[PDB]
């Protein structure tokens, strides 16, 4: 058993052709595209005229990066590594022209230039020749190219075939051919073909390249575990991929290509949590933002009304999405994500100002309003929300019930409010208590009238300011809390308790102070959701193993799969749907799905009849292969029914006898090793 990059058995690989169908109604195919290298490439070619001539490997296939070139031109094999400037359609140009004599190759159009050469080989043949015979593809060549830890390995095999299409069903191992110590980073590769000049091709004279009948197949290796069979001479005469079907896995586990009748545990299946769950206690009682926002009375800008918010949770998504506010400026903070954080001090300042003055309510703004009526700090993580109020703050005759402060000794500090009747006096022209020259009262009249323009209409502005303190925060927004999912395996995190299980409705009655739930083994059994108070149970995910019920490979290769201790609905979720397409999902689900007490049985047909137990499944259920033939699961019969004819005066005296010899085997000793 070897774990290495292999081509999975019964895979489905790409097919390429290079052929010009006779006549103008046919197809002119020159398949030679640049293909990814992946972690390994399997290359096969069925040919009779030897159109294939080599390969190209590299990352960009240009002078930018190093590349590897392999070509054979009917008497040599050349391997080179250079920063070749490959053509977009490289090939070898065969020519029927009699320049010297016979067919020859004369148009080497693979690469424009070779630079920064590292090494070159002139190794001996893959010959092959320049012959153009027809009929069936008489040779089959298989190659495996691998590039690992700075070494490039090439395996190859050559066999004669009598096929005309597809690949033979025979089995053959590809012996190593060459290994190269190259640190190149192969990622894309391309195929080289020997084209024929239509200008100088037998019968054809039109300008162009024509390709003879050629067919090659490309596959990609994957990391697989294979069970290879070495014969007396060391040749790999057979192999088994340990991923193809349950029978293959059973053979691989038993390390044998022949499996006897019985049930074998091959692997263990686990159901992973779907995506996630995270939960913390959502929120305390809502804060009274409506009072400030929908306040019956609003104070002047110089006397903005402040409401302190504490012992609650901020919530404004209902009004934010309404889009009913003319301004929702949140400076330096997301308009919604700010709520998800603890805030020790929260304030709501409401005032009525002119529409043009709303722009002055910004952190760090300076002016006759910001520096004298409402000053915001630079560290303003709050939001200033302004909306028109002409429908309430306007009437016939106008309103004259507002004041604003314009004169003061110094600019106001952030969240600084001061109301006084002291008369401001100029330094050079003091008044000493009177409103004289260069002396003005701090407050000035202010108001609105219906005739005012849009920019001059009243606007209600509410500022929700937040600041952090060392003291514990009361207005806090919860951390990432997702929605609850039930009856579905998932990885949950309840207030720091990380667990994986299935959340379901529970009838257990906790206590008001109880959150967790435990069993005799001190394992989390039930949990209470902190956001909303209800009790949910915790259950393991699936656990359980996988057993491959099968008769002997001799007789039939049909098998059945048993998944212990799981409902028959979770079988495809146990990391299934990723195995081999045509062999595993058939046993993953389908018809004849039976729910035994020992687990879920698939591939076996339940039968009313009861027979002698053939293969023990468990809980009185046994499986047999005999009935067209198919695996059947039944309740084993504990022998044939009988009822002795008993009466008070009847006896049975035997009239004949049989001398029966029976064999008993008893181990007497085990090998005495030291």
């Amino acid at each position, epitope marked *: 058993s070897t774990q290495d990059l292999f081509l999975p058995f019964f895979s489905n690989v790409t097919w390429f052709h290079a052929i010009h169908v006779s006549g103008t109604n046919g197809t002119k195919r020159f398949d030679n595209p640049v293909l990814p290298f992946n972690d390994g490439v399997y290359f096969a070619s069925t040919e009779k005229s030897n159109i294939i001539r080599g390969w190209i490997f590299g990352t960009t296939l240009d002078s930018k990066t190093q590349s590897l070139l392999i070509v054979n031109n009917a008497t040599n094999v050349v391997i080179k590594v250079c920063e070749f400037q490959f053509c977009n359609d490289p090939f070898l140009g065969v020519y029927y022209h009699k320049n010297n004599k016979s067919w020859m190759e004369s148009e080497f159009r693979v690469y424009s230039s070779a630079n920064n050469c590292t090494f070159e080989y002139v190794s001996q043949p893959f010959l092959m020749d320049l012959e153009g015979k027809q009929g069936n593809f008489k040779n089959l060549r298989e190659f495996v190219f691998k590039n690992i830890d700075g070494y490039f390995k090439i395996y190859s095999k050559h066999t004669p075939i009598n096929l005309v299409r597809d690949l033979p069903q025979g089995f053959s191992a590809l012996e190593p051919l060459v290994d190269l110590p190259i640190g190149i980073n192969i990622t894309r590769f391309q195929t080289l073909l020997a084209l024929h000049r239509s200008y100088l091709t037998p019968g054809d004279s039109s300008s162009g390249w024509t390709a003879g009948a050629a067919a090659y197949y490309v596959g990609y290796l994957q990391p697989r575990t294979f069970l290879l069979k070495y014969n007396e001479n060391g040749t790999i005469t057979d192999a088994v991929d340990c991923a193809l079907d349950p029978l293959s896995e059973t053979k691989c586990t038993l390390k044998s290509f022949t499996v006897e009748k019985g049930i074998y545990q091959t692997s263990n299946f686990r159901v992973q949590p779907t995506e996630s769950i995270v939960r913390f206690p959502n929120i305390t009682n809502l804060c009274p933002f409506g009072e400030v926002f929908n306040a019956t009375r609003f104070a002047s800008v110089y006397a903005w009304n402040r409401k302190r918010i504490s012992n609650c949770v901020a919530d404004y998504s209902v009004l934010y999405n309404s889009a009913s506010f003319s301004t929702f400026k949140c400076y*330096g*903070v*997301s308009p919604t*994500k*700010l709520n*998800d*954080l*603890c805030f*020790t001090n929260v304030y709501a300042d409401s005032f009525v100002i002119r529409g043009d003055e709303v722009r002055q309510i910004a*952190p760090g703004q300076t002016g006759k309003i910001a520096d004298y009526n409402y000053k*915001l*700090p*630079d*560290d*303003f*993580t709050g939001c200033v929300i302004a909306w028109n109020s002409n429908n309430l703050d306007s009437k016939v005759g106008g309103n004259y019930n507002y004041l604003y402060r314009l004169f003061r000794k110094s600019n106001l*500090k*952030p*969240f600084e409010r001061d109301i006084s009747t002291e008369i401001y006096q100029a330094g050079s022209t003091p008044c000493n208590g009177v409103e004289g020259f260069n002396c003005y009262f701090p407050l000035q009249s202010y108001g609105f009238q219906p005739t005012n323009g849009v920019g001059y209409q009243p606007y209600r502005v509410v500022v929700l*300011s937040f*600041e*952090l*303190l*060392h003291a514990p*925060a009361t207005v806090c927004g919860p951390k990432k809390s997702t929605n609850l999912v039930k009856n579905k395996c998932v990885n949950f995190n309840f207030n720091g308790l990380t667990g994986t299980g299935v959340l379901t409705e529970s009838n257990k009655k906790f206590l008001p102070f109880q959150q967790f739930g435990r069993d005799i083994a001190d394992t989390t059994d039930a949990v209470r959701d902190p956001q909303t108070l209800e009790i949910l149970d915790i259950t393991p995910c699936s656990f359980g193993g996988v057993s491959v019920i099968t008769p002997g490979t001799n007789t039939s290769n049909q098998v059945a799969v048993l998944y212990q201790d799981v409902n028959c609905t979770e079988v495809p979720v146990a990391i299934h749907a990723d195995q081999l397409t045509p062999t595993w999902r058939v046993y993953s689900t389908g018809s004849n799905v039976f729910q035994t007490r020992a687990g879920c049985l698939i591939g076996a047909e339940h039968v009313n009849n009861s027979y002698e137990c053939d293969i023990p499944i468990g809980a009185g259920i046994c499986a047999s292969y005999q009935t067209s033939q198919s695996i059947i699961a039944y309740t084993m019969s504990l022998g044939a029914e009988n009822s002795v004819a008993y009466s008070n005066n009847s006896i049975a005296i035997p009239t004949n006898f049989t001398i029966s010899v029976t064999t008993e085997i008893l181990p007497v000793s085990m090998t005495k090793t030291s």
Partner: nanobody, 122 residues
Framework: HVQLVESGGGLVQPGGSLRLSCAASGRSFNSYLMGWFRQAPGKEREFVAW?????????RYRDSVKDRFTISRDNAKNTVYLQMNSLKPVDTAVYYCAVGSLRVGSFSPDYWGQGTQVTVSS
């Protein structure tokens, strides 16, 4: 007892760059603003920069240190990293790291360290 320890100081000629670091221990600093202050010999201490540990990083700098000094913090380690770029001789001073609260929207230091010398001269 909340304690602050500085590191990363030394001598750096003009045109160089440095990384000053301070580690804070004693309690969680999620609701704390972390910043740096410097005081040159013969001159009063001056505010350099401060940054908030909230999910939204609120960051500030003094007028002279705009676009040349950078401040960052890591809440997992309760550490603050300060980047000096395009240092001039005027930057020679003792630099301290401060843990403070956000009072009235102004960074108010609460805990101070010992400080490290950062000299700028050829």
């Amino acid at each position: 007892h909340v304690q602050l320890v500085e590191s990363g100081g030394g001598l750096v000629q003009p045109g160089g760059s440095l990384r000053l670091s301070c580690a804070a221990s004693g309690r969680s600093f999620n609701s704390y603003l972390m910043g740096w202050f410097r005081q040159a010999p013969g001159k009063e201490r001056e505010f350099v920069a401060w940054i908030s540990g909230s999910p939204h990083d609120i960051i500030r700098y003094r007028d002279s240190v705009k676009d040349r000094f950078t401040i960052s913090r890591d809440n997992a380690k309760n550490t603050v990293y300060l980047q000096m770029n395009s240092l001039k001789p005027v930057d020679t001073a003792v630099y301290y790291c401060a843990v403070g609260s956000l009072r009235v929207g102004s960074f108010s230091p609460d805990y101070w360290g010992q400080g490290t010398q950062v000299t700028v001269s050829s």
